[PDB]
Ligand binder design. Structure first.
Ligand SMILES: O=C(N1[C]C2([C][C]([C]C3=C4[C]=[C][C]=[N+]4[B](F)(F)N4[C]=[C][C]=C34)[C]2)[C]1)N1[C]C2([C][C](N3[C]=NC([C]4[C][C]4)=N3)[C]2)[C]1
Length: 290
């Protein structure tokens, strides 16, 4: 019987890739009508999926880039227990497999990464694993340092799971009101059935703590060009992390844009913020492609 997504659609009817663990990942592609100037992989964050990047991907495709993405394991239309990962490196390995596959089909093209939140931590670790390979990285509120109050609370709960056998332990869900000041976007997020809005399992939170530790060790090795966009009122990824990334990365081409008063999800924020985010990404990638 055909292998199906967690929503029961056969993978033979969808673009897909099988990872090193034999798990099917659902894929998306947005290719221009002509010869692409560059490739760009979009890395989504925790709980969400690649379908949330439709508008950004169509803008990037309008710049003649071939945009590609997949749903990370345990997310969206990919296989895996929801919001579970054996080790955070699985996400990085799977991005690298997909980038390597695309570079075979489109050789000689520059490749960029774009990531938001947990997806931004994945993009940083992917670029750190392959120094000099990526042309540039666009980071939207990347997970570099978690909110101090939330991290201390979770680190206590993590000690309970690390010292004892407690497989079902979960913390509370990611509060939707702190995601964006745009209420319509929050309402849409709360209505998408492919988004997992359940409480974070302690085993998954432990992997996000591993991502933060690994990002910290990767910064003095990071040399890829990057554009970093961060809101000053982010309650999920503390803005101190964006300043730390600007300070500690060795990249010769690094830029930070702060959005005063904005919340976490800058590409789904108030129209003035979202319009600026799209324009800034468009300028930055346009200047670095030809
Ligand atoms: O990747 C992330 N996640 C990673 C994230 C930061 C983490 C902080 C944290 C940590 C860190 C270590 C350990 N922890 B933890 F587990 F203790 N923890 C608990 C709560 C936060 C937190 C949790 C947020 N997101 C959330 C989204 C944005 C959402 N969206 C998509 N469309 C929209 C529209 C409405 C605007 N919103 C999906 C991508």
């Amino acid at each position: 019987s055909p292998r199906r997504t967690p929503q029961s659609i056969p993978y033979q009817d969808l673009p897909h890739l099988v990872n090193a663990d034999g798990q099917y990942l659902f894929c998306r592609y947005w290719a221009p009508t002509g010869t692409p100037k560059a490739l760009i992989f979009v890395s989504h964050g925790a709980g969400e999926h690649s379908g949330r990047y439709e508008e950004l991907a169509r803008m990037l495709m309008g710049l003649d880039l071939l945009v590609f993405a997949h749903d990370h394991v345990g997310h969206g239309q990919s296989e895996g227990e929801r919001m579970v990962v054996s080790d955070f490196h699985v996400f990085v390995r799977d991005v690298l497999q997909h980038v390597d596959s695309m570079q075979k089909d489109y050789p000689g093209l520059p490749v960029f990464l774009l990531g938001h939140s947990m997806g931004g931590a994945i993009a940083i670790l992917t670029a750190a694993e392959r120094p000099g390979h990526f042309a540039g990285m666009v980071l939207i509120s990347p997970l570099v340092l978690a909110n101090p109050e939330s991290a201390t609370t979770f680190k206590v709960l993590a000690a309970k799971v690390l010292n004892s056998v407690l497989p079902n332990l979960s913390s509370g869900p990611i509060d939707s009101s702190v995601l964006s000041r745009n209420k319509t976007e929050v309402d849409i997020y709360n209505s998408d059935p492919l988004i997992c809005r359940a409480g974070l399992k302690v085993c998954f939170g432990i992997q996000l703590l591993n991502a933060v530790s690994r990002v910290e060790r990767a910064l003095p090795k990071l040399t890829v060009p990057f554009l970093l966009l961060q809101g000053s009122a982010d309650r999920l990824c503390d803005s101190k992390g964006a300043y730390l990334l600007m300070e500690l990365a060795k990249s010769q081409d690094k830029t930070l844009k702060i959005y005063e008063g904005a919340y976490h999800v800058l590409h789904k924020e108030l129209p003035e913020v979202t319009n600026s985010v799209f324009h800034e990404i468009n300028m930055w990638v346009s200047q670095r492609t030809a």
